[PDB]
């Protein structure tokens, strides 16, 4: 096989249809299902799979008590087949760590996992299921990465890391790998103030990532990387339709190269597909918590500071808990264009549901259609009372 090249553009997005759903917490009430969080999806030339960061216990096991914490030596990046739950018996460990990213280049796959204490963390880059490169913390404050898939163009796979405080300025870097080996890296450029957890997709020899400002921005920072020249830039989304969480209510005019006021120093991971009038942003329904999830067609959201919704689709109702969300595409499908896809993490347990002592999630995934399909809402489905 040769290295994949981003030769196509995006298909027209007129609506979203279900792609995959695992019902992990329903099934796990009586099965050997692992406690997880921070999931994603990623394809190979021959199959697409579910990915997530395990917590080293099953939901019903006594060690599930205290799983709200995010960093320990008992986590690892796992992958199971599309739509099954993350089972003790069917999961394949990709690497050990509490932060990650992964992606195929046409030939084979590259995975990255970060572990260690907050002041002495390090990343080990696996290529073809073997360790190839290691990177030590440069700012001694929680080295961390995307938490969703990377993208490659002719062997080159860019990946973005951050090290430094959340509530303030950090040192973000963009590394350019090829066969797990570093070709180069460069510090963040452009107008972006802070960059966390990037969600990326590629089309026509270009890669675009929508990230999280935490510190301040309620409107999202966007990075554009050229995998051939190995350069990038950054800016913010102009639209007044805010998409972070927590966030203030929608203003009438937004800001293009400055983050949005009102709320600061917290957030959630998300994504968008910026393609002119073929632009769709996703966001939670509540401005206070991670409840609900909806997609909105906001033409030219990137460059137009007065853009508003033109069409929409509700994924999870306001009463139902959601969480992180990100992007992926099956770059090896047959066709004249790339079909956009995404997933949403449905968190159950602490902190919102404190009758239980654990924290876990399920996954709902959808892809675009050129048709105008009718909608349904996709919640987790588990009855918390059954766990008492």
């Amino acid at each position: 096989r040769d290295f994949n090249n981003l030769t196509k553009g995006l298909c027209t997005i007129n609506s979203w249809h279900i792609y995959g759903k695992d019902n992990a917490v329903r099934i796990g009430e009586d099965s050997d299902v692992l406690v997880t969080r921070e999931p994603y999806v990623s394809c190979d030339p021959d199959e697409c799979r579910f990915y997530a960061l395990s917590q080293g216990t099953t939901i019903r096991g006594k060690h599930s008590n205290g799983t709200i914490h995010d960093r320990s030596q008992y986590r690892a990046l796992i992958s199971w087949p599309l739509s099954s739950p993350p089972t003790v018996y069917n999961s394949r460990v990709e690497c050990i760590g509490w932060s990650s990213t992964s992606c195929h280049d046409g030939k084979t796959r590259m995975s990255i996992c970060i572990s260690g204490p907050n002041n002495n963390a390090s990343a080990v880059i696996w290529y073809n299921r073997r360790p190839v490169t290691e990177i030590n913390t440069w700012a001694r404050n929680i080295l961390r990465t995307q938490e969703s898939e990377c993208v490659c163009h002719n062997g080159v796979c860019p990946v973005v890391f951050t090290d430094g405080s959340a509530t303030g300025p950090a040192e973000t870097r963009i590394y350019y790998f090829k066969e797990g080996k570093i070709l180069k890296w460069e510090p963040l450029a452009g107008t972006a103030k802070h960059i966390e957890e990037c969600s990326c997709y590629g089309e026509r020899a270009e890669i675009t990532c929508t990230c999280r400002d935490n510190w301040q921005g309620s409107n999202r920072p966007v990075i554009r990387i050229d995998p051939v020249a190995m350069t990038h830039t950054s800016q913010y989304i102009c639209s007044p339709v805010l998409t972070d969480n927590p966030r203030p209510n929608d203003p009438t005019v937004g800001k293009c190269n400055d983050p949005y006021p009102g709320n600061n120093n917290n957030g959630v991971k998300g994504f968008s597909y910026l393609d002119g009038v073929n632009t769709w942003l996703g966001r939670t329904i509540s401005i206070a918590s991670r409840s609900g999830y909806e997609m909105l067609k906001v033409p030219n959201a990137l460059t137009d500071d007065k853009s508003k919704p033109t069409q929409g689709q509700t994924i999870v109702l306001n009463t139902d808990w959601s969480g992180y969300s990100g992007s992926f595409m099956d770059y090896w499908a047959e066709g004249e264009c790339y079909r956009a896809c995404f997933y949403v993490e449905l968190i159950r347990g602490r902190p919102k549901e404190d009758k239980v002592w654990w924290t876990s999630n399920s996954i709902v995934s959808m892809c675009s259609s050129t048709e105008f399909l009718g909608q349904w809402d996709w919640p987790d489905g588990a009855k918390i009372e059954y766990f008492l």
């Epitope: 203030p248 009438t252 006021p261 709320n263 401005i287 206070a288 306001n318 009463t319 919102k352």
Partner: antibody, heavy 122, light 108 residues
């Protein structure tokens, strides 16, 4: 017609805890955010927090987290607020209002209760 | 958070006239500002919401306006039942904050 009726005045000693109610009527309780407000001399009107009976979500004003606890009884359509470790600084009038924007955080507080007065001292 | 300031806490006026109370926000709140009426008996009522929308069954002599940081409420021709304290509140971002209030007294 929408009507929110609150409990009676509380005369309490320092160090006690109290629990007041707000009985809702004339609307579908599970579809609206229920807000709580405090009114006192030399301080004015302050928002305390929010409880949405639809799924049990809550949020507090950093100032009042530790003092108050939002709870509700979906069957009796009653919402409650407990204030703990009472100090004379808590003597004031307390109100419960409804979200004019249903489950959203806009539209103002469209209907209020008449208020419950808590008087703390020895 | 956003601080709301209601200039002048007292407004002695005479029945029949047209008063105007104002509120100024520490920052742009994109029209997300509302007005309430607290009677001398304890009753609180929503008058206007979103800079100028009238809540149901509110006497049409009440009107509001503004933009950015400056907003106002106007009562065309005072009646005796307009004796109350008026407050402004924002809901552009949490936590919600209210103004200091302005006591309106129909001067004897």
């Amino acid at each position: 017609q929408v009507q929110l009726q609150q409990s009676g005045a509380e005369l309490v000693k320092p160090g006690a805890s109290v629990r007041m109610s707000c009985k809702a009527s004339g609307y579908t309780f599970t579809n609206y955010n229920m807000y709580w407000v405090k009114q006192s001399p030399g301080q004015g009107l302050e928002w305390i927090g929010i409880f949405y009976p639809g799924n049990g979500d809550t949020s507090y004003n950093q100032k009042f987290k530790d003092k108050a606890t939002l709870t509700a009884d979906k069957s009796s359509n009653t919402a409650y607020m407990q204030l703990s470790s009472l100090t004379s600084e808590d003597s004031a009038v307390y109100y419960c209002a409804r979200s004019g924007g249903s489950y959203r955080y806009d539209g103002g507080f469209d209907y209020w209760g008449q208020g419950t007065t808590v008087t703390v001292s020895s | 958070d956003i601080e709301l300031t209601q200039t002048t806490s007292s407004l002695s006026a005479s029945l029949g006239d047209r008063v105007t109370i104002s509120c100024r926000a520490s920052q742009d709140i994109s029209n997300y500002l509302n007005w309430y009426q607290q009677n001398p008996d304890g009753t609180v009522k929503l008058l206007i919401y979103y800079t100028s929308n009238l809540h149901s069954e509110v006497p049409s002599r009440f009107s509001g306006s503004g933009s950015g940081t400056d907003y106002s409420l106007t009562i065309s021709n005072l009646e005796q039942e307009d004796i109350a304290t008026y407050f402004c509140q924002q809901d552009f971002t949490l936590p919600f904050t209210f103004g200091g209030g302005t006591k309106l007294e129909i001067r004897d």
